[PDB]
Amino acid sequence: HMRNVMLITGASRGIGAATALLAAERGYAVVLNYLRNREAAEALRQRIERQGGEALAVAADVAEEGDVERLFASIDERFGRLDVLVNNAGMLEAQTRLENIDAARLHRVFATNVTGSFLCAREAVKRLSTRHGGRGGSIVNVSSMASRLGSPNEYIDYAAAKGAIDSMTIGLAREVAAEGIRVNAVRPGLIDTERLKGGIPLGRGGTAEEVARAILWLASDEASYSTGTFIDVSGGR
Amino acid sequence: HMRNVMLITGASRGIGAATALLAAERGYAVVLNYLRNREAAEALRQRIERQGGEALAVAADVAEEGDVERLFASIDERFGRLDVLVNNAGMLEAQTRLENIDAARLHRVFATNVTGSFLCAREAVKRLSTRHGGRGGSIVNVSSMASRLGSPNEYIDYAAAKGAIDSMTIGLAREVAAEGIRVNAVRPGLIDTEIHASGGEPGRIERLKGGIPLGRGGTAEEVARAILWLASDEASYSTGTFIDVSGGR
Numbered sequence: 001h002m003r004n005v006m007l008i009t010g011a012s013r014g015i016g017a018a019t020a021l022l023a024a025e026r027g028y029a030v031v032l033n034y035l036r037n038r039e040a041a042e043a044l045r046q047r048i049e050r051q052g053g054e055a056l057a058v059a060a061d062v063a064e065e066g067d068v069e070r071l072f073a074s075i076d077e078r079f080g081r082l083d084v085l086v087n088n089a090g091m092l093e094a095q096t097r098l099e100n101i102d103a104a105r106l107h108r109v110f111a112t113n114v115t116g117s118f119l120c121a122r123e124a125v126k127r128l129s130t131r132h133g134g135r136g137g138s139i140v141n142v143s144s145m146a147s148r149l150g151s152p153n154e155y156i157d158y159a160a161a162k163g164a165i166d167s168m169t170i171g172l173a174r175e176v177a178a179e180g181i182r183v184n185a186v187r188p189g190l191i192d193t194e195r196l197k198g199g200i201p202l203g204r205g206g207t208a209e210e211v212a213r214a215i216l217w218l219a220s221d222e223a224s225y226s227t228g229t230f231i232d233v234s235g236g237r
Numbered sequence: 238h239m240r241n242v243m244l245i246t247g248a249s250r251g252i253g254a255a256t257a258l259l260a261a262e263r264g265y266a267v268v269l270n271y272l273r274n275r276e277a278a279e280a281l282r283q284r285i286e287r288q289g290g291e292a293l294a295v296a297a298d299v300a301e302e303g304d305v306e307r308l309f310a311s312i313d314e315r316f317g318r319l320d321v322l323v324n325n326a327g328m329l330e331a332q333t334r335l336e337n338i339d340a341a342r343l344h345r346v347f348a349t350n351v352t353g354s355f356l357c358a359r360e361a362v363k364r365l366s367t368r369h370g371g372r373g374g375s376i377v378n379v380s381s382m383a384s385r386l387g388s389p390n391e392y393i394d395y396a397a398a399k400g401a402i403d404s405m406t407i408g409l410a411r412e413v414a415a416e417g418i419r420v421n422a423v424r425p426g427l428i429d430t431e432i433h434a435s436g437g438e439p440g441r442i443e444r445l446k447g448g449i450p451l452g453r454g455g456t457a458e459e460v461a462r463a464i465l466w467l468a469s470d471e472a473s474y475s476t477g478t479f480i481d482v483s484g485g486r
Contacts, residue, residue: 065340098355098409099362103302106352114397115343118335125336147400150408150477159408160351160401163384167400171387172335228387 010089012037018208029054062116087117113161136180173228189234201236247326255457266291299353324354350398366416373417410477426483450485
């Protein structure tokens with residue numbers, strides 16, 4: 001009778017929104033965290049509700065520790081529990097070479113992509129861990145094939161942020177395995193939203209729904225013996 | 238009269254000091270960048286100068302853009318050229334689980350380990366690149382086996398920082414290969430000089446030494462030799478690669 005509760009950061013559009021809708025379709029109560037696009041997040045909440053589900057939309061900048069504390073407090077108040085965190089909030093800036101990346105850009109890119117994922121994972125561990133009275137659960141980080149390919153001539157800063165996420169995925173998986181938390185990641189490639197497709201063996205961009213399906217599998221009981229692992233959703237890139 | 242010029246960040250002790258000393262012994266002019274340990278950096282500069290070498294010591298915080306720009310301006314005026322950057326400046330905080338890592342710690346750990354390496358790499362590209370009147374050169378990032386192992390129950394924030402370095406190594410290698418700049422990394426494991434004992438934790442320290450196939454910690458000199466090889470002409474077809482200096486860990 002009791003729905004499991006999933007928090008999706010950056011849930012208003014793209015992979016985050018597709019993951020929210022897929023999770024609700026599969027029975028989860030969903031927390032849609034957004035930063036700016038309140039309209040899009042509220043419409044997704046209304047949609048999930050119309051179809052008989054439970055959804056909570058919460059504005060919060062995951063780069064800010066106080067915002068993260070309030071985001072999770074809002075989940076505590078509405079549902080009294082948490083089961084899955086999807087660290088999807090990401091930030092991509094303009095195409096650039098590294099010699100033109102300044103400190104302000106590095107601060108912004110690491111704050112949202114990396115610090116945000118750490119701070120949300122931290123609050124999730126405090127709630128999911130059997131050592132804090134939780135019943136376990138899972139965290140799925142949304143990384144990128146950029147961590148492996150390096151995004152040369154585009155955004156090495158973003159590639160580095162996602163390399164940090166991959167290392168955090170491995171380390172956190174090992175650290176909290178014994179308290180009932182699995183930690184995994186998906187690595188999307190080019191998500192469809194001629195030269196670029198040619199570097200994709202399957203010959204097309206991926207869809208947000210394809211990434212969502214991988215995220216949901218890793219959060220599911222089907223993946224009960226997978227932690228510290230990666231599903232690449234990249235068409236062979 | 239025209240030595241190749243190597244900038245080493247975090248050069249006052251440990252891996253950075255060993256790398257500066259070895260580079261100077263092999264004929265480089267060296268720039269010893271350091272944060273706060275002036276006595277150690279000055280003693281190193283004097284040692285190199287006594288042996289007939291060329292060394293410039295510069296206090297600068299690589300996390301701070303204004304300091305980085307001044308640091309490279311000082312190289313420009315003293316040597317008028319740059320050939321190798323060793324991104325060694327690193328930062329480790331106390332043992333922790335992730336649930337107790339707060340934003341202020343993450344900011345500090347990424348500022349010194351990641352932002353500093355980006356900002357120095359950026360200034361190095363501006364000088365080494367054949368597109369900007371350089372003759373090429375090398376960047377060697379000092380990463381860690383933590384990037385691969387994750388540092389669970391120790392410092393996942395540091396492991397993440399070093400995973401960021403590994404990805405930057407790959408991406409920058411691909412980006413600036415056509416400008417004459419090779420970019421590689423070393424991944425030290427447990428290095429004797431780099432363990433800062435806090436008192437009362439022999440069990441923790443012993444656990445840290447455990448499960449190393451070669452059965453011992455490494456030396457700063459072992460790391461320096463790998464750095465210098467990657468910066469040398471012997472490595473002329475290697476870019477975007479990694480030498481693990483970890484005893485098999």
